[PDB]
Each structure stands twice: as structure tokens, then as C-alpha cells.
Amino acid sequence: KQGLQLRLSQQLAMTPQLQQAIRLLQLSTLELQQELQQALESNPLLEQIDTH
Amino acid sequence: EYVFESPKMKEILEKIKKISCAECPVLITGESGVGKEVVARLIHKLSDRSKEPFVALNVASIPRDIFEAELFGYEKGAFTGAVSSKEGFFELADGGTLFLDEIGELSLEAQAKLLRVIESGKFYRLGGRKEIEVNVRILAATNRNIKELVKEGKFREDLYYRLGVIEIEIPPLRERKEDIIPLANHFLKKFSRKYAKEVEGFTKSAQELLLSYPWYGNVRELKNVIERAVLFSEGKFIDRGELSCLV
Amino acid sequence: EYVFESPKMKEILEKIKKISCAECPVLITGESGVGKEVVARLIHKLSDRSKEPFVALNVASIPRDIFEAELFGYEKGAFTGAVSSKEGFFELADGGTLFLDEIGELSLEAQAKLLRVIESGKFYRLGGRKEIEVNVRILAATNRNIKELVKEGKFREDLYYRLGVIEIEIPPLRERKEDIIPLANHFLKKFSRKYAKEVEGFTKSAQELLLSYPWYGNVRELKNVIERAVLFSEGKFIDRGELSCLV
Amino acid sequence: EYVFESPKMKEILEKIKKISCAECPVLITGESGVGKEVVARLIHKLSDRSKEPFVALNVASIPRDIFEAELFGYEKGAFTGAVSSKEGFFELADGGTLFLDEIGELSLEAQAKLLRVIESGKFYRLGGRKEIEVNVRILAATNRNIKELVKEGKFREDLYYRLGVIEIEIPPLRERKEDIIPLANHFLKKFSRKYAKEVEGFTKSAQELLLSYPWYGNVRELKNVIERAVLFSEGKFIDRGELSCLV
Amino acid sequence: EYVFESPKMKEILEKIKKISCAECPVLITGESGVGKEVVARLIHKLSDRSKEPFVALNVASIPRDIFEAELFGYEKGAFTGAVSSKEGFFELADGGTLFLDEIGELSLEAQAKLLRVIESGKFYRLGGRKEIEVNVRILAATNRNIKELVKEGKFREDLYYRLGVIEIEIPPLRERKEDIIPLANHFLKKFSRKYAKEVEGFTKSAQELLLSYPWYGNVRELKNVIERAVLFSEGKFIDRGELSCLV
Amino acid sequence: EYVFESPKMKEILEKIKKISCAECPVLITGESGVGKEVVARLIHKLSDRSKEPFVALNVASIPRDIFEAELFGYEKGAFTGAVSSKEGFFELADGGTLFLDEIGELSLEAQAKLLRVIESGKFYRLGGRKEIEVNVRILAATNRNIKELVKEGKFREDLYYRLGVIEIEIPPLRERKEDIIPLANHFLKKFSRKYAKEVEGFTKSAQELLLSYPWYGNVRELKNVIERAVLFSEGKFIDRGELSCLV
Amino acid sequence: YVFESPKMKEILEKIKKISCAECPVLITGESGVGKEVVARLIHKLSDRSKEPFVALNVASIPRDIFEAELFGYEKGAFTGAVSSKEGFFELADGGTLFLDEIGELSLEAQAKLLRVIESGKFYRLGGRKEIEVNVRILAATNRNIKELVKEGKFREDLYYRLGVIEIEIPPLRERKEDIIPLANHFLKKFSRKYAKEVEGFTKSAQELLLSYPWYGNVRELKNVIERAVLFSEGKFIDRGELSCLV
Ligand SMILES: Nc1ncnc2c1ncn2[C@@H]1O[C@H](COP(=O)(O)OP(=O)(O)OP(=O)(O)O)[C@@H](O)[C@H]1O
Ligand SMILES: Nc1ncnc2c1ncn2[C@@H]1O[C@H](COP(=O)(O)OP(=O)(O)OP(=O)(O)O)[C@@H](O)[C@H]1O
Ligand SMILES: Nc1ncnc2c1ncn2[C@@H]1O[C@H](COP(=O)(O)OP(=O)(O)OP(=O)(O)O)[C@@H](O)[C@H]1O
Ligand SMILES: Nc1ncnc2c1ncn2[C@@H]1O[C@H](COP(=O)(O)OP(=O)(O)OP(=O)(O)O)[C@@H](O)[C@H]1O
Ligand SMILES: Nc1ncnc2c1ncn2[C@@H]1O[C@H](COP(=O)(O)OP(=O)(O)OP(=O)(O)O)[C@@H](O)[C@H]1O
Ligand SMILES: Nc1ncnc2c1ncn2[C@@H]1O[C@H](COP(=O)(O)OP(=O)(O)O)[C@@H](O)[C@H]1O
Ligand SMILES: [Mg+2]
């Protein structure tokens, strides 16, 4: 029966467990550096080795 | 501890005593406030399995989509969420007694699920590949006429014969005119001592009013009225006006 | 804080003060906007559970398919997605007070689930295999006459008997002519400080008008009318013209 | 031991002997308490594969979401929580007899899957790769009028034709009067040893009463009445009055 | 952008100005195309919530079986699909204004599910054991006579007084003859500017026609007719011939 | 392309050309088989969104429960069974044109779901708290008199004035005596190449019969008759004998 | 399949004649006459021999989920839609869809069926892409479809769409010449299937087959022959065994 219902169900779920850290392979070095720059900006606990 | 002063109640007590050596499932039919739970527990106590666990279930509180899981159990990995195997209610009552209350509130889909467990008692767990053999003594209580439901189409014909091996009909308190007074006094000792009151009896007019007043709710309504009268009393007895406004 | 000047409400207050030590379930009936929840909270405050949570639940919005799951709790592994343990209202309010609002809105299917938890206080969690008992005080508020609904057949008779240990009926505001003026004064004094209004009293014609309106919405309608008068107030006294909405 | 002293019953038994060596699905349609399980187990016993397991399963005891995960099985990794692969009940009865109780409760998709399995002869796991072949003998017993179900559309006509190659109809006990007496005497002695109640049999009036009562449960109702009589009787002869109250 | 030339519109605007600091919920009643949304947004802008988010929602756009989930949100493990904790629309508009559009079409069952939220602001999420306190000013709009729907039994009287603290009535445009000419001029100017049309007003016959037709869609129908005329316009001045769809 | 010969078709095409610069929603009224969808596609091509996608939907087949689900999409936790977010039809038609076939047959209850989306263009998904703005042009085609449905209490006047800004009327084939021969010749030429029958034209009797007949199914019925004649002919020209399907 | 009667020969010739015809074909008659057999013969004898013959009966389709079987659904479309499902039109992409007993369909469902056929494009319940398929329609009717239309329990447009080529199969009650060949074929098939030595029916029993009106036609004939084979104990079958079934 067609219908959007809220209920308690006992069903079997497949294994879609993927799509994590996989997009870091297709990128080149430059785009990877851009992503790392974004990550450094958004996370205060990440720092990159410098020379200054 | 209870009151069984009525001759019909004495006959029912004798029937309960006579099935001490029996194990077939028993059905109880009657109205509200008659003592279906009391009769079930008395049968359990007089049965040889009194020391065995006694599990009471209401069939209206189990979710629709997990009905098979609760009464049969499952092994780990049977479904997404079965991280640890569980034992069902029937295996909890393995060797003991299982009492189903309000059994007339069971959907027709869930009624056919209990055809083989009552007869043979053998069932396969959800994800269980080995048959399980148990010994269960089954008691059931209903508040409506089971025969009418069977003849009307709201109850399975097979299930009535599976459960209706020994049928006990508890009479209403209205026909038990000789049980109101012994109960009404007892409830008094149940209430005043619990409330530290000074009521030690009932007036003759109050007793006559209670006898004349119809107990549609039976013992439950009588207890509620007596408790209210004790709560709103003032003196060493209960006069007519203390309960006239209620009954 | 609240005002109780009508002589008939004095009897209800005395009855409340006479059930301070009681812990039996209480049922309350009355028209909409008369203060059933206020009476329930007043009973809760005078009870020995005054230092306990007062869990007020609306039974007219609980989803049906999880209704039991929302009142009994569940274990881990009971169903898909239940990766943690959680409780219901009965266990979360153990030792306190559970106040059900609009008990008449409950459908018949849901009314058959608490029949074994109001009296004995015991139930079983979803996926649990251990019996649990709780000691809670059950209060309910409703507006439609439960007795006439039981007579018609829209409410369970046994559940009504179980819940109706002590019944409190609140009369309509139209029957209470001794509280209209005090409640109007209280609302005026409350709303003259929130908006810094200069209103300090009512006019004699306005007071006479207040004694003629049937008060269909009762206390809520009176509060709304007083709020409208305060918001739309220019002079220090509220004349009969500003109360023409009652004509 | 089973009693068959009716010419129709003897003809049915000879049919059972003739068909017990066949390799075709069997459909058993009859009234309540006629012995469908007894007939199926007699077919299984009087066969070359009598040593093989007799897998008796109820179509209403399987949740839908795991039906293909129960009657067929599953492999590891096909779904979350699948720690280890588990065989299905279909492979369990390989080379033996699989009995389906109350075949009329199956859903459209379940019946379609069963028809696919029966027609193909080989099936697949839930998440496997190879194809599994079995040599099962399929019996199914139901009490519903399959003609009404197929006319309404609750059962697939092709599946009914495949399973219902041979229709076995056990006559109602009301048409088996000559076989009524030997059955009850079989129970009366059996319960006499079971419950230690001393009884020799029935009287002429009791036997005439039994032949006059319109049994609805057939064997089950008669057995229940006999068990009640054995429990509630201390004398060696059962009189008309003892059985009259039960009737 | 909004023209208020009728004296009733000026009275409504002055009343809105007086209730800028008023935080109570308001109910607006009118016809189709009278300006309920415009008046509600003007009330919102003039209130203290000018910079607060204004969440406008239609009650009929939510399915019945997930209405509570969309109204209050849900916690983890509440149901098969409660992946993570989610907030409701009431928690979405914290500190702002909630606009219930077309409240008349709401069913009786849904009106009983929001009786405690409006008056007190406290509600429990699905699966959440903590109480949620929110402060949202509620503006409801309807095209129906709710004061008659409460009498007819098609609306719940309990919610009427919860949304009846302040009530606004918008008269139809056919009575607002001071608005027809200014609204027509503004619409013609806007549709000439958008469509690059060289029209800059109406003719006297067209003005007389616009003031005599019994408009049923009111301002929206006037806007539609003006747009239709502008699209098919062929001169610097619009004559009665272009507006032939009126009469 | 499309052939238009009658003066009414030329006028309709010219009006379409004139209003192609307009972005107003269009409502088209006619009969079954008059070519409303062809006119809608012509309108889409002649507008500035010809390169933009055109989404045409027959709303007479959408289930009521998934009406909001299809129109608005949903999020991960909107309901049970969903695992991923889904787009809505309006979002799928964002930046283009959305066409609705047979808008008259739509249920009265579901017409409230499109009251705000057409005007505001802002809506929330199921299970979401974010408002989405689009730019979609609404075209609706119907074979029923919308105004009659409004007057008989079957259609929502607000939705009508939302869509009833631009009106188009397509007369049936019974008023298209001039536009019968070109359509018949076009269909004959198409089906001759489709089925390789190589039929060139029609004889005098066939043309007379086709012209004299007051077609009720209009262009659809004429095309079906031509296709049947092509399938059941072997000559170079179709005579009246091969047109025996007509009255 | 065996066809020996002159009516059966004419039916086979007509079916081979309409083999090159790609139009939807309607077949009507009585129960158990071979409408599915004739439809499969048309399928094999046409250019779509290698394509699937998706044959389904519209009687068992539930009312509320008819659309769910008409088009199909995706993952998460509704409760119970764990995965995606393909409708019969998608399964029969390039094949032949055979709807058995079309005369019993509800009126409202029919109005939602032929609309898919004429346009040929449809959307999945939960899919954002339009689906275009090509099918050949075969229909079966158990009653008088013209009478049903005259009773207002059907659609005239659907009848015209499926009435391009219509076939009537005479039942077994007027096909007595095929009785002996069909009985012999079924007897041999069941004897070789159950591995029991049975030669053929005796002269006495041959009268009962013609005496039997055969209301159930070939289905009942096959059931009776199989049951007679199962209970047979000799290489010859007498009239007594058939008497217990007739
Ligand atoms: N003979 C009796 N003596 C004393 N108390 C009794 C007697 N019979 C019943 N009661 C009391 O009646 C109360 C109400 O429970 P009762 O056993 O009557 O249940 P009921 O109304 O028949 O149904 P349910 O099975 O749902 O409890 C019990 O608390 C019990 O103490
Ligand atoms: N004696 C009183 N003094 C002051 N205010 C009072 C008094 N009695 C009632 N009220 C006021 O009446 C108002 C309306 O009461 P209440 O909220 O209980 O109405 P209701 O609509 O019947 O309730 P429910 O939410 O249970 O449906 C309360 O907010 C309360 O402040
Ligand atoms: N010949 C017999 N002799 C003795 N007892 C018999 C005989 N035949 C059947 N019975 C009894 O019949 C009882 C019920 O039979 P069975 O288990 O076959 O039920 P059923 O007809 O399949 O039930 P249902 O249709 O209600 O599911 C058995 O417990 C058995 O003792
Ligand atoms: N004073 C005004 N000046 C200009 N336009 C106006 C005025 N009053 C109303 N309108 C126009 O009326 C149209 C409809 O307004 P609105 O959205 O409020 O209608 P409604 O049917 O009352 O709303 P809803 O049903 O969504 O609550 C708008 O396009 C608006 O421009
Ligand atoms: N000439 C024949 N020779 C052998 N078997 C035949 C013959 N005609 C029909 N049958 C048998 O008849 C049975 C039913 O066939 P079929 O399903 O095609 O007929 P139907 O019931 O008339 O059709 P439908 O239900 O599809 O309208 C099959 O098992 C088939 O083997
Ligand atoms: N100008 C035209 N040229 C060719 N065919 C046309 C023209 N107008 C209409 N038609 C035909 O008429 C049919 C009408 O189809 P449609 O518009 O979908 O249904 P309705 O007319 O009932 O809305 C189309 O299939 C189309 O082939
Ligand atoms: Mg059985």
C-alpha cells in the first residue's frame, strides 16, 4: 500500500558502506592542496609544516 | 484471603480445585470487576507449577510488526538489529504458566500465529533452524462473549477450540448479593488502616443501599466507592449520606 | 496567586485539601477554558509528590504505531534503528505525577493498552525480558462527559472505572458569578504592568456588562477580553463602550 | 494409534496408501479438527522417505521482511549484520517432506515466490551466486474454501492447479457417526491412565447423546469434551447428566 | 508598494500600529485576494520581530502520518528511519513569527494535537525525553468563518480561543471603492514598466467600468484583469474595449 | 511541424505569439482530443524557455499519499523506507515549464497543496527546514468547465485566480470543418510510411464521409480511423468501403 | 501443442496470418480453451520470437497498488519500497505483454491503462526521468466484451484499441474430434512422467469422454487424465476409474 508511515520495522539493509576518503585519489596535487587549505581553515587543530 | 461466600463462587472454587491435576489451557469469561486475574492466580497457586514462573501478557500492547519476534525470539543476524539473540515470552514461560489478558483484542492476523504453539508447543525462532520443544500451561481471560465473536467472524473458529478446553464463567456481583457485604467490610480494613482512619463499621441503611445499588463495575466500583466514603468520612462509622451522593 | 472566591469552588478546594495524603488516580471534567490543568497542578502541589516532576502529556498527538513504544520504552535490538536504550513516560516519571490531557481524544485501540499498567503499575519494555513496577500518581483531564461517551460507546468502561477513583467537576464560568469580577481585576492588574498601561479600574456599567455575558470561552475568553481592553486603552477607567465586544 | 472405522475414511486411507509413493504436491482441504496434520504425518510415515526429516512450517509464522530470508536462506555480507550465512528451510527438507500449515494465509508475493520455486525446481539464496537444487515432497493443508479465495483473487489459480492435482477432503464428523464411538473410547481410556481417573466407558444414554450432538470441531471438540468428562468424574460409568451440561 | 486609501484600511493600519508591541497570536479572516498575507507581513514588520525570520507554512501540505514529525521533530531511535535527531518547524522559527496559512482547511484531529504548544510553548519531540521551550508569535490566516465553524462542529472550539486573542477582519474589495482606482493605477504602472509598454493610464470610461463591476477575486482578480489588459494593450490609453471580460 | 488552417487556429497561434513574452500561467479549456498538449508544446517552443526543459505530467495517476512526496521530494528521515533525498517535480521543472494534463479531475483536497507554490514559489521539503525558491511557468489543460466546478462547490477559487490569468479555448473538431482534410492527409501520409502501405490519398466518397461526420473523439479518433484504414487497405487510395468503422 | 479439428486448423492458419501483424490482438472464448496457447503461438510466429512473453492475469492485482505494478517504484519511494521495482511494461521492453481476463478490470483502472499505451511513455513512482518503452499488447476476455461495454462496465476506446484483430476460440464442447487425440497425448505424457506402464483407454471408456460435456474443457480434461493415471494399476484404463471422477 502506498503511504508515508512512521512505524517500527524489522527489515534487512544492504551494505552501502563506501564513499569516504575516495575523492582524494581522483584529484591532482593542486586541487588536493586546495582541499587541505579548506580543511586547515575549518579545523583549528590542523596545522601544516612551514618554513618562516 | 479473597471472598468466595456466594454458592456459585464456591462452585467455581471447587472447579478450580478439581483441575489441580490438569494441564489443558483454561478460558475465563465474564464482565469487568469479576476477578479474572484473581481466578487465574488462584489456579496458578493450586497448580503443581505454582513455584514455576508465571508470565502475564496483554495482547494489545505488542507492536504490530514485532509480534513474531516477541513471542518466538530470534538469533543474532536474523534481521538488521539482531546483534544479540533474545528469548521470547513463551520460552520465559517454559515449564511455567502463561496468562493472556484481554485476548479478545487480538487482530485476526495475529490469532492464526498461535495455532500450533497451543497444540504442540513447537516453533522455530526467527533465524532459528532447529525446532524448540517446550511445556507451557495456558490461561486466557476475556471480557466479552467468545462464542458471539466466533459466530460473528471477529475471532478464529480454530482458536476457540484450541483455548476453550475448560471454560469458567464468573457471575456478576449483582447475582452475588451475598458477597457485597463480606467484601465491603474487607475493603474497609484495606483502607482505614492504610489511611489511619477511625471507621470500624457500616450503618444498616448504608448496607441496604449497597445491596440495592447495582454494581455495574462490580468489585472495582465497590472498592472505589468505599475508598471515597472512607476518604470523605467524619465519625466512627459511615452514615447513609456519606455514600448516598455516590451510589 | 490564583483566585478562588466562588462558594462552589470552595468545596472543590476543600476536597483537594482533603486528599492531600491520597495517591489514587484522579479524573477531572469541565468545560474548555475553566482551568482543569490549574486544578491538576494545585492538587500536585499539595500532594506529597510536590518535589517530584509533573509530567503532563497530550495523548491526542502520540503516533499510534509507536504509541506503546512511546509509553513503555524499548531495549537495544528490539527493532531496526534502535541502536540505543530508551525509556517511556511511566519509567521517566516513576515516583512522580503523570497528567494526561484530553483523555477522551484517545482512540479505542489505544485505550486497551494501559489496562494492566494503571492498576498494578507493571509492564514490559520492547525487547525486555524483566518485569518492572512503578509507583506513579495518575491524573487525567477531559472536557466531554466520559459517562455519556461510555453509554454511547466511544470510551472504555473498565478504563473509566480504573481512572475514575476520584472525580472533580469544574462548573462553567456562567454559573460562577462570584469570580467574574475578581478574575477580571486580576487580569487587569496582570496586564497593566506588562505594557505599562495606566488602567487602574473598571466602570460600573462595564462591571454590570461583565455580569451579563455568558462567557462561552469562560476564563480564557475573559483573559483575552481584558488583554484587548488593556491594549486598546486610552483613559484610566474602562468604560462600557470599550467592552462592547460583549454586547 | 489412529482409528479409521468409516468406509469413506477407509477409502481415503487407501488413497493415502496409493499416493504416498508419488512425487507431486498434495493439497488437504477440510473442516476444523479433521486430522490434516495426522493425514500429512501418515503420508510421511507410509513412504519410502519416512526416515527423512518432516519439516512442518506455518505460513503465518514467517515475517514478510525475512520470508525470502527464512524459506530460502541468505549468505554472509548480503546485508548489514550478516555475520554468517544461514541455510533456508527449503534446503532442510531436501529429499524429505515439507508441510505447509494453513496455506491460505500466504500473500501474493509469497505465493508467487513459492510458485517460482516449485516450477523451476532450483532456487537462489538471498545474496548468493550459485543455484541450489532440492528434491522435496510438498504437502500443504488449509481449511479455507480455496474456490472462494481464487474467485476473489487471494490465491493464484496456476499455483492452486499445480498444488491441487489431488484434493483430499476428510468428511465432517457429523457424516462420520459410525466412527464417533471408537474415537471417544480411545480418549476415555487414554485420559484414564493419564489423569488416574477410574472410568470404564459410557452408558447407552451417553452414547446416544454423543451421536446426536452436532459437532463443529470434529475430533478436537469431541476430545475436549471427553477430557472434561474424565477430569470432572470419579465414577466408572459416564452418565447422560455429566455430558449434558457440557453440551 | 501597498495602497491603503479606504478608511477601513486606515483603521486596520492604526490598529496594527497599536499592537506592534503586542506579542499575542492573531487570527485574520477574509475572502480570496483581499490581502491577508500582506496585512500579516505588515504586522510582522511593524512588530519587534522585524529582523527575525518569518516562517510561513501551510498545514495542508503535510501528510497525516508524519504530521507530528514535521511539527515537533524527532530524536534518534524513535522509529524505523529516525537516523539522527531532527528539529521541527516550531523550533525552526525560534524567536520569530510562525504564519499558519489557510488554517480553516485543517482537520479536527490535527487541531487537537497543538492545544498545549500554542498556550504554553512546551512540547516533547518524538523520542526526546527533554522538554522543549520555544517562543514564537503565531499569525494564522483563513478564508473561512471560523466563528461559525466552531458552532457547526467542523472546527474545535478549544483552538478557537487559543487563536482568538486578536481577530482581524478584512472587508472585500467590492466595498473598498477608495482602493479600486489607486490599485488599478499602481498595477497598470507596474505592468507597463515590466512589459516595456507605452501605456500610462486609463480612460474615463475604463475608470467608470472598474468602479462598477462586482469583483469576486477582489485585489487578485483586479491584478489579473489589469495584467490581461496590459498584455493585449495596443495604445497609450486603455479603453473599455480592452476590459470586455468584466461585463 | 503543426498544420493550422481554420481561422480560429490562426487566431490562437497569433495570441500565443503575442503572449509568449508573458510569463503568466496559462489555463486551457476544451474537450478530449482537441490538441491541448500540442498547443502547450507550441507555447513552450515559442517562449524564451524553448531550450529549457519542458516537464509535462498527467496528474490523474499520482497517488494521494505520495502527492507531497512527489511534488516536494523529501529528506533522509522524512518517513520509513527512505534512505536518500529526492527532488520534487517543481525542482525538476525549475528554470523551465511545468504542464499539468487534466487539471479538472484533480481532487478538491489536494488543490490546497498548490495554493502557495504557484504564487510565492517558496516551499519546504518533507522532513526539511529549508525554503526553496524556483522559477517555473505553470501550464494547465483541462476538458471540463472550471468555473462550473467552482460554482458547484468542487474547485478552489483561490487556485483558479492563481491559474486563471491567461485563458485559452480550443474548439473541438465539430467546429473545424476546414481543418479535417489537411489533418486526414497528414495522418495518411504519416501512416503510409509507418506501415509501408504506400497509400497516396482518398477518393471522393471517403473524403465526403470524413467531412460530413461530426467527430466526437476529434483528432484522436480521426487519427485512429486513418491508422485502421491504413492497416486494412491494399490500394493506392482509400475508399468509403475501407472506412466501415464509422457510423 | 496439438490441433486437429478443422476449426483448430482455421485458428492456426489465422494466427499464422496475423503473425506479421504488429497490432495488439484480442482473444475471447470460454475457460480452459487455449487463449494463452494461441497468444504464445502468435508470439513465436512473429518477428518477436526471441523476445520475452510477459503474461500476467489482472485478477490477482491488488486495487490499491495497481499503479505500483503499472509503472514501478524506486528505493525509498514509500513504506515497503526497500528497493526498486520494474512494472510489466518495463519488463516487456521489446516483448509482448499478455493481459489475461481483461474484461474483469475495474473501470477507473482501465482509464489509467490505455493512456500509457497510446503515449508509450511513463514515469516510475519515485523516478525523476521519463521512461519510453515499446510493447505489443495481447488481451484475453472470458465474457462478451461487447455486452460488457453495452452494460457500462468497460471502455469503448479501449475496446477499439484492442479490437484491431479479434479471435474467438470454440471451446471443447464443440471439439469432440480432438477428444481422443488430447486424451491419448495426456495419457502418454503422464505415463512417461510418472514412469508407469499404461498403453491406452479401452473401448468401453471411450464413450464417457464424448458423453462428458467437458465444462472445464482442456484443464479439467488434463486433471482427470492425470488423476486416472495416478490411480491406474494396469496398462489399460477401464470405465470404472473414470466413473469415480465423472
Ligand atoms: N473475591 C475477591 N475478593 C477480594 N478482592 C477481589 C475479589 N475478586 C476481585 N477482587 C479485586 O478486584 C480487583 C479488580 O481486578 P479483577 O481481578 O476483578 O480484574 P477484572 O476487572 O476482572 O479484569 P482484568 O483481568 O483486566 O484485571 C482486584 O484488585 C482484586 O483485588
Ligand atoms: N482561579 C483562577 N484564577 C486565575 N486564573 C485562573 C483561575 N482558573 C483558571 N484560570 C486561568 O484560566 C486559564 C485557562 O485554563 P486552562 O488552560 O486550564 O483551560 P483549557 O483550555 O480547559 O485547558 P487544557 O489545556 O487542559 O485544554 C489558565 O491559563 C489560568 O490562568
Ligand atoms: N485418527 C485419530 N485418532 C485419534 N486422534 C486423532 C485422530 N485424527 C486426529 N486426531 C486428533 O486430532 C487433533 C487435532 O488434529 P490436527 O493436529 O490435525 O488439527 P488440524 O485439523 O490440522 O487443525 P487446524 O485446522 O485447526 O489448524 C490431534 O491432536 C489428534 O490427537
Ligand atoms: N494595498 C495593496 N496594494 C497593492 N497590492 C495589494 C494590496 N492589497 C493586496 N494586494 C495584492 O493582493 C495580492 C494577493 O495578496 P495576498 O497574498 O495577501 O492574498 P490572500 O489570498 O489574502 O493570501 P493568503 O490566502 O495566502 O493568506 C498580491 O499580489 C498583492 O500585491
Ligand atoms: N490442444 C491442446 N493440447 C494439449 N493441451 C492443451 C491443448 N489446449 C489446451 N491445452 C491445455 O490447456 C491448459 C490451459 O491452457 P491455457 O491457459 O492456454 O487456456 P485458457 O485457460 O483457456 O487460457 P487463459 O486463462 O489464458 O485465457 C494447459 O495446461 C494446456 O496444456
Ligand atoms: N495542429 C496539429 N497538427 C497535428 N496534429 C495535431 C494538431 N493539433 C492536435 N493534433 C493531434 O491531436 C492529439 C491531441 O492530443 P492531446 O493534446 O494529448 O489530447 P487532448 O487534445 O485531449 O488534450 C495529438 O495526438 C496530436 O497528434
Ligand atoms: Mg491444520
Side-chain angles (χ1 to χ4, degrees), chain G residues 80-142 144-240:
Chain G
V82 181
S83 64
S84 302
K85 186 183 178 178
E86 307 182 358
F88 33 69
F89 275 101
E90 181 179 358
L91 296 178
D93 183 68
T96 55
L97 180 63
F98 173 80
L99 300 181
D100 189 4
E101 203 172 352
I102 195 60
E104 305 296 330
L105 237 183
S106 56
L107 179 61
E108 191 170 355
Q110 297 159 354
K112 202 182 294 182
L113 181 59
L114 83 170
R115 180 185 299 166
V116 192
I117 301 181
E118 50 181 6
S119 298
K121 307 191 68 183
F122 65 101
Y123 289 82
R124 307 273 285 270
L125 283 76
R128 290 298 160 271
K129 55 181 178 179
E130 192 173 18
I131 307 303
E132 185 173 8
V133 297
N134 62 94
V135 294
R136 180 181 184 179
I137 305 298
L138 304 177
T141 309
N142 199 26
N144 302 29
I145 181 170
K146 303 193 64 178
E147 182 171 353
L148 297 182
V149 175
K150 271 294 185 176
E151 289 185 349
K153 313 301 294 182
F154 207 71
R155 291 299 298 270
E156 184 188 16
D157 299 74
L158 178 55
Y159 190 18
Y160 193 87
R161 288 308 304 173
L162 297 185
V164 183
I165 295 184
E166 47 186 343
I167 315 174
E168 167 63 27
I169 309 175
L172 188 53
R173 58 184 67 258
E174 50 180 338
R175 290 172 60 253
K176 297 185 178 183
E177 286 73 17
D178 319 68
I179 283 296
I180 279 81
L182 293 188
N184 298 10
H185 183 264
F186 294 154
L187 187 275
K188 281 182 171 53
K189 187 176 181 180
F190 291 136
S191 180
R192 71 99 53 92
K193 188 174 187 177
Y194 292 107
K196 53 218 309 176
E197 303 185 9
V198 180
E199 198 279 335
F201 311 96
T202 58
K203 180 62 176 57
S204 59
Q206 294 174 355
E207 305 293 328
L208 181 52
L209 302 185
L210 275 68
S211 180
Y212 208 19
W214 294 113
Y215 289 160
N217 292 323
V218 204
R219 187 79 68 174
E220 185 183 7
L221 168 62
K222 176 179 298 181
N223 301 332
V224 168
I225 293 301
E226 189 178 10
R227 280 138 59 187
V229 168
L230 291 173
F231 291 100
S232 60
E233 65 281 353
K235 41 182 56 62
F236 292 87
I237 295 183
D238 63 330
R239 60 198 299 178

Side-chain angles (χ1 to χ4, degrees), chain E residues 1-5 9 28 30-40 99-102 140-143 170 173 176 179 182-183 186-187 190 217-221 223-224, chain F residues 115-116 119 158 162:
Chain E
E1 184 175 352
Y2 296 147
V3 161
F4 303 98
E5 258 76 311
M9 306 308 297
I28 309 176
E31 298 186 354
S32 64
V34 296
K36 302 191 301 294
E37 173 85 12
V38 163
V39 173
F99 177 79
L100 309 180
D101 193 67
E102 300 294 330
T142 175
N143 68 91
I170 303 180
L173 186 59
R176 302 154 58 182
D179 302 354
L183 289 178
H186 184 200
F187 285 154
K190 180 176 184 175
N218 303 270
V219 192
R220 184 175 298 111
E221 182 171 355
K223 178 187 181 61
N224 294 14
Chain F
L115 291 180
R116 300 191 56 85
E119 291 187 341
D158 310 63
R162 280 153 166 78

Side-chain angles (χ1 to χ4, degrees), chain F residues 180-181 203-215 222 225 239-247:
Chain F
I180 297 179
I181 303 301
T203 60
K204 174 60 63 180
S205 63
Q207 301 283 24
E208 180 67 36
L209 180 60
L210 294 178
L211 181 58
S212 301
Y213 185 80
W215 302 92
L222 178 59
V225 169
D239 57 74
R240 185 176 299 189
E242 304 171 358
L243 298 181
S244 302
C245 301
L246 302 183
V247 178

Side-chain angles (χ1 to χ4, degrees), chain F residues 56 58 60-61 63 66 70 74 79-82 86-88 92 102 220 224-225 227-228 232 245, chain G residues 22-23 67 71 74-79 81 112 115 118 123-126 128 160-161 163-165:
Chain F
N58 188 277
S61 60
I66 67 171
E70 290 285 353
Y74 50 85
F79 52 86
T80 301
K86 187 171 300 301
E87 298 183 5
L92 179 59
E102 298 176 3
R220 192 75 57 86
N224 278 325
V225 169
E227 181 176 1
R228 291 300 305 273
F232 293 88
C245 301
Chain G
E22 304 173 343
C23 55
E67 306 84 7
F71 313 107
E74 300 294 331
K75 161 188 55 182
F78 58 101
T79 55
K112 202 182 294 182
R115 180 185 299 166
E118 50 181 6
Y123 289 82
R124 307 273 285 270
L125 283 76
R128 290 298 160 271
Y160 193 87
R161 288 308 304 173
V164 183
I165 295 184

Side-chain angles (χ1 to χ4, degrees), chain B residues 45-77:
Chain B
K45 188 181 70 63
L46 288 185
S47 62
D48 298 70
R49 58 186 69 261
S50 60
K51 306 298 298 181
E52 302 290 341
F54 178 86
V55 180
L57 286 174
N58 179 26
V59 299
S61 63
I62 291 184
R64 185 186 311 172
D65 294 334
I66 70 166
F67 193 90
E68 293 82 350
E70 290 294 336
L71 285 317
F72 296 81
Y74 53 82
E75 304 293 333
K76 56 172 303 178

